[PDB]
């Protein structure tokens, strides 16, 4: 008897109802009289109000039902919230389960604790007025709307027995984001993969508006969420005696069915794509605050989103209207004199671990495993001549992630936006194919690898495969996420949330356990100009994550294939930081043997004693190179230089860390003023080609002593179609550029270097003027390789 | 008798197909002998391929009975391409109806103009291969998909016999904007917009995956796009001989539907959102080239996106099966002798301005009226005294909107994200109200201003409403974008793909007329942290917008109320920019008059007079601030400093426009050497308060003589939770962290400024200590104002 509910138990959930309600209230508003002992004056209201109201009765409606179900069924679920102006509901809700007592003491269940406990609330040295990391169990900021469905299918991405309640609010449905996340449950195998229950809280209104899905007809609406693929059950009403029957019921029943779909396809028998049950909320926005304030409605309107009567310490009328409030869910009943829930509210309460605030999926740290790495050093190539041998840069890295893939299978995925396959990674199909979790036809085998047991994630939404990994890192669980770099704008306010995460959980938060590291590789970068992605692409994401610390987020620039192996290798082992690896998966020249590539990799930073001049003499210009095209632009130049000027000596540095440049001050990964000057010297110009925009090194590298002879080139503009030489003689990152750069700087070349500099200006014409003829680079070009 | 047609004009409907189809292939590969007079062999085809074929039919398909319908109809439509790769299929189409010819003399129509015409396509010194702005009839770049559904809205936001044809590929629908715009038909007012009628082409596949669409059951599909509001009707075959019945049967009948809509509509008998009719295609992608390659299955597959064959030179037998797939269109009764459409194709092309290619709207510059604006010195707050009157900053400015709106009743929309009441603009509801087009309740006009004739958006998704705005000008009209600066990441990459667009098209392309500017206002800054917008807001979007170059990009911070007017009326009559306005809504301290704020904005930058210290001397500082609530710190040290060093000259500056420190060599618009160190003096230090980060002002003002003396003060982090002066503080952005700046940078005043230093330590430490207190700054921090 599940769906039903006793007369006295309902009473029990009622209780828990108000008490959750009166503390959502009491955070907004009180700071010190917290049962109301006293009558309320204007000194125990927050001066400044901040806190959001209008979602809060609704989510702590869900927390009471769902627990429930946990006591009854011995369920766990994670409730991930999508409002997240709803953190007051949340926190009343932990505290009363006790998980936020025993996570932080000081707010304790008592009178002097719940003084405490609201006075915290949206407080200056206190917690935030959103689901920060502070937040028990929770994995989602909810401060940007959009991404809350995703992040709840990422968690039960390999949680069999997880369920994971995620709360929409109508107006986060809007956005685009979360348009594409319900199309999610395609990609989710019931027999491994736990079951998400999206909740759609439809209140009807957003901060000054009707929302979108609550002005179309119940009709449009149910056929809407049948064509996303789930089955939608309504509950709607505002009378609190009607809807704990309806919602209980509702509940019991979507569980059934979601236990009864896993049931199945764990069993074999039904492995096809099941209709997950959908829940729609038509609760009244606000609706236990006061009706009328000013004349205006404000129960179940826009009027009750955040503070339904902000001027109250100027007002006493409204002052009174608040103390009315508060007495409105009779206090005198729901907590004993010490000021700690009563019996009855304490024996509803989950036990332990089943509490969804305590639950340890939120805090997924605690789960997590290390990965079991295999020896990179056998999917190294063999470079017996740095410089002149050729081989593909991205084929090692998926042969390498293939050997992850069957070491790790249930702890470790790869998500990809259509392009694993343009990436040139299909090694990695050798094991384990694409999860497709639809309908199949015989021509799908021939061509593509789809299968229900699928290690790697494939859609084109960038939104939604950026959701999926975040959450499943947060779980505890590893990733490697492989896209293109002039697509990367895309997840832009994504990366800026999760790293806004892990800054305050690695600082602010102590009991929040080191998640896995969010590992981003980027390739078909801006200089190849391949035939996908739009012709004017940007490195403009490289420079939008530095402004992020260097202690939250790394970029790496791997030159050849080898240091990508390495790279790969050691952030699959780091833990909290957002790394970016920028390669390209053109055929290139190789310069790293395995050994090498891991000691380049271990300083992040190194002269290249190959490419270099002359050793034991100091150096007349010290050329430096970041990405991998502008490496090998570089090395021309060095070429051309070493073959026109016998005499002149050139240091050749190659960078991969970029936070490197960054002095030791502003990080401790940061390379010493000693170390820099001793790679750059103290007093010689320094040719820098990069890829990217040019002015990135200079804000690194500001601070360091020789920054006024640092002279950097990099990308500036993209012509609508060009050569990939044509395109860095635009740019001037040419190797024929580069070669004029440094007989400009150099001092003792510039009367020397002057009919020099008049033949390298001919080969760009010469190369030009051959590009737009034929519409391809001269074959010396493209079978360039170093001639020492 | 529409809806059939005739087995004769079928057959020049076919011959139109596969002449279109025809030009599509011969742009991809061929670079000589167009008509394949001579066999064909490898000094013909192109060295190297970037073209996309899959996609190309489709396009082409709908873009041939579109034009019947034309001609029967007398509609006029624009044809909005989703795809964007598809781009060889809208200029053959556009060749064949002579557009091409016309707007390009030399690509005429004949075998020399054919062979010209397929060289170009792809090539260096050639036009791109997605819908750049070089192609005729196009508003929509296609590059970066999911914004193809949105413009073809916002083309028709005004446009009342317009109807926009928006073809979207199925892999396109996946992305997370795409899903959302299509509840933009919600927006759309029957009585006075056009009509949009999106065609998705449902191919099956992407580059390498089944999409998601196709995948799912049909009914599962027809479901999903009524719950948007659409009625759907579906093509499906492979058999030409068949679609073509089909598919001019359905368009027919679709057209009827949207012209009975908007009738009844406009005749007033029935103002309810009607079903909007929408088309499916199920065709096969590349569904005429190769059957199968190198035995896989290439027509109708993954295979089938860009080049069927890439290895073409190589290989011969590839070259002949690549000459045996041109011959399957049979060109010999395609193209007369001279190489131009026989006399059965030109008698089924649309005449004069009628053709999708030519329609004057596609190149919306010609249509576009100048915005009659009201003088803006009739919304003026009255200043008697500078920085001593306080007023709000949004106010007037919602007012003057009023204006506009009132006296531009049809080419001017407001777009705000569901927070135009909370930007405190609500004196544009004194005239019109938003637009919703939903169902409604009586509770909505007490309280929010819903009509049909609205002239502002309002949806909370900015994908789709920046969408709207940039479709909206390019057609020719003018608009406002208010929003806040929080979410101004999500917008992020449309920005980028229309400053790339106003960029060619105002420099390459030479016959597209100047569209109007792209106004953006960024209200709540992150120095305020209201309610609203997550806890780490972030001000990097000025840094991204900062790296287009100030030709298409201007970066406007007023200080004031009626600063923030000027700005606004100047930037309403510019043509080709992206200009970013970054206001306050805060009731501020006010600073210039009404004709005082109209000469600093035409300066962009200058000296406040009533605030600087001494003139007729040498200034020992120079104070300068960009945005306005780091103006009020800045004034405050400023304040600070003459009441404790009375001898003490201080400069003060503030700069409106950001790009005005740019050199004059950078841009012509930026402040020449003399000018800028007639302001900024040659030799003393600059003490510089940026809303935003520090780093933005090194980057513009590096080049200048003065740089090294630049000390700027910016954002650098935000904590979980402050007050307005806390804020500052931790940025050391504060009134007093600025006076200590200058005590330690005055040469003279670090030995007789130890003890003030030391005071003013111990008020930030006292503020501190009472916000944390209290939760509230003191009241003398409030309601400060200039004392001088
Ligand atoms: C993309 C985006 N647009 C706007 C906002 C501003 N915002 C913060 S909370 C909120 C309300 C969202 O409404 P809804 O999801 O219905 O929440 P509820 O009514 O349950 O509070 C809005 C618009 C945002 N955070 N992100
Ligand atoms: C957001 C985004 N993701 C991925 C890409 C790369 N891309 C460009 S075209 C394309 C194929 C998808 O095209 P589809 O919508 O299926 O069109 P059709 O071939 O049916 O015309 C892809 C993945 C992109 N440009 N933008
Ligand atoms: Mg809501
Ligand atoms: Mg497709």
Request: aromatic share 10%; hydrophobic share 40%.
């Amino acid at each position: 008897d599940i769906a039903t509910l006793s007369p006295n138990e309902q009473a029990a959930i009622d209780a828990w109802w108000r008490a959750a309600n009166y503390l959502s209230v009491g955070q907004i508003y009180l700071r010190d009289n917290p049962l109301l002992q006293e009558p309320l004056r204007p000194e125990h209201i927050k001066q400044r109000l901040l806190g959001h109201w209008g979602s809060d009765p609704g989510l702590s409606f869900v927390y009471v039902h769902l627990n429930r179900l946990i006591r009854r069924l011995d369920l766990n679920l994670i409730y991930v919230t999508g409002p997240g102006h709803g953190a007051p509901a949340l926190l009343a809700n932990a505290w009363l389960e006790g998980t936020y007592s025993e996570v932080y003491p000081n707010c304790q269940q008592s009178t002097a604790g719940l003084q405490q406990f609201f006075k915290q609330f949206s407080f200056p040295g206190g917690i935030g007025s959103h689901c920060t990391p502070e937040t028990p169990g929770s994995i989602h900021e909810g401060g940007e709307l959009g991404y809350s469905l995703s992040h709840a299918f990422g968690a039960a991405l390999d949680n069999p027995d997880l369920i994971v309640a995620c709360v929409i609010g109508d107006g986060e449905a809007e956005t685009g984001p979360l348009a594409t996340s319900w199309h999610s449950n395609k990609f989710l195998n019931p027999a491994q993969d736990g079951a998400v229950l999206p909740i759609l809280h439809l209140n009807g209104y957003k901060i000054a508006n009707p929302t979108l899905l609550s002005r179309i007809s119940h009709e449009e609406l149910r056929s809407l969420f049948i064509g996303y693929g789930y089955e939608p059950f309504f509950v709607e009403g505002n009378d609190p005696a009607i809807l704990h029957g309806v919602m209980a019921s509702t509940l019991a029943t979507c569980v059934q069915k979601i236990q009864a779909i896993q049931a199945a396809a764990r069993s074999g028998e039904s492995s096809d794509r099941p209709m997950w049950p959908m829940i729609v909320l038509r609760t009244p926005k606000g609706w236990t605050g006061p009706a009328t304030i000013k004349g205006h409605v404000v129960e179940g309107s826009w009027r009750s989103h955040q503070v339904p009567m902000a001027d109250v310490l100027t007002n006493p009328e409204h002052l009174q209207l608040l103390e009315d409030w508060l007495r409105s869910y009779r206090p005198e009943e729901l907590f004993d004199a010490s000021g700690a829930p009563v019996a009855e509210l304490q024996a509803i309460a989950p036990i332990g671990d089943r509490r969804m605030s305590a639950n340890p999926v939120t805090n997924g740290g605690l789960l997590r495993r290390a990965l079991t790495l295999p020896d990179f050093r056998d999917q190294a190539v063999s470079v017996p001549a740095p410089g002149k041998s050729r081989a593909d840069s991205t084929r090692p890295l998926g042969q390498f992630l293939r050997e992850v893939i069957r070491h790790n299978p249930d702890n470790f995925r790869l998500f990809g936006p259509d392009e694993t396959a343009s990436n040139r990674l299909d090694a990695v199909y050798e094991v384990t194919s694409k999860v497709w979790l639809g309908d199949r036809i015989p021509e799908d085998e021939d061509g593509g690898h789809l299968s229900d047991r699928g290690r790697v994630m494939e859609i084109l939404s960038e939104h939604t495969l950026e959701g999926w990994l975040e959450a499943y890192l947060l779980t505890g669980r590893h990733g490697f996420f492989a896209t293109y770099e002039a697509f990367a704008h895309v997840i832009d306010s994504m990366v800026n949330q999760h790293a806004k995460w892990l800054d305050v959980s690695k600082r602010e938060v102590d009991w929040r356990a080191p998640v896995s590291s969010l590992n981003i590789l980027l390739s078909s970068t801006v200089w190849r100009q391949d035939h996908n992605g739009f012709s004017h692409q940007d490195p403009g994401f490289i420079d939008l994550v530095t402004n992020k610390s260097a202690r939250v987020t790394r970029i790496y620039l791997p030159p050849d294939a080898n240091c990508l192996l390495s790279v790969a290798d050691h952030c699959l082992r780091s833990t909290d930081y957002i790394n970016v690896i920028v390669a390209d998966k053109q055929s290139h020249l190789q310069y790293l043997d395995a050994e090498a590539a891991a000691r380049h990799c271990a300083k992040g930073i190194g002269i290249w004693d190959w490419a270099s001049n002359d050793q034991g003499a100091s150096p007349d210009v010290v050329i430096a190179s970041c990405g991998d095209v502008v490496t090998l632009e570089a090395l021309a130049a060095t070429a051309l230089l070493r073959e026109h000027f016998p005499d002149l000596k050139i240091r050749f540095v190659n960078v991969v860390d970029l936070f490197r440049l960054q002095p030791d001050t502003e990080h401790p990964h940061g390379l010493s003023d000693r170390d820099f000057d001793s790679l750059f010297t103290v007093d010689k110009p320094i040719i820098f080609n990069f890829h990217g925009y040019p002015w990135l090194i200079h804000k690194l590298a500001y601070r360091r002593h020789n920054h006024n002879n640092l002279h950097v080139r990099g990308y500036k503009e993209v012509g609508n179609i060009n050569t990939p030489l044509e395109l860095a003689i635009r740019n001037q990152v040419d190797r024929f550029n580069l070669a004029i750069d440094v007989i400009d700087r150099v001092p003792h070349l510039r009367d020397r270097g002057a009919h020099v500099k008049e033949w390298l200006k001919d080969q760009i014409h010469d190369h030009i003027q051959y590009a737009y003829q034929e519409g391809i680079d001269r074959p010396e070009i493209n079978q360039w390789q170093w001639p020492f």
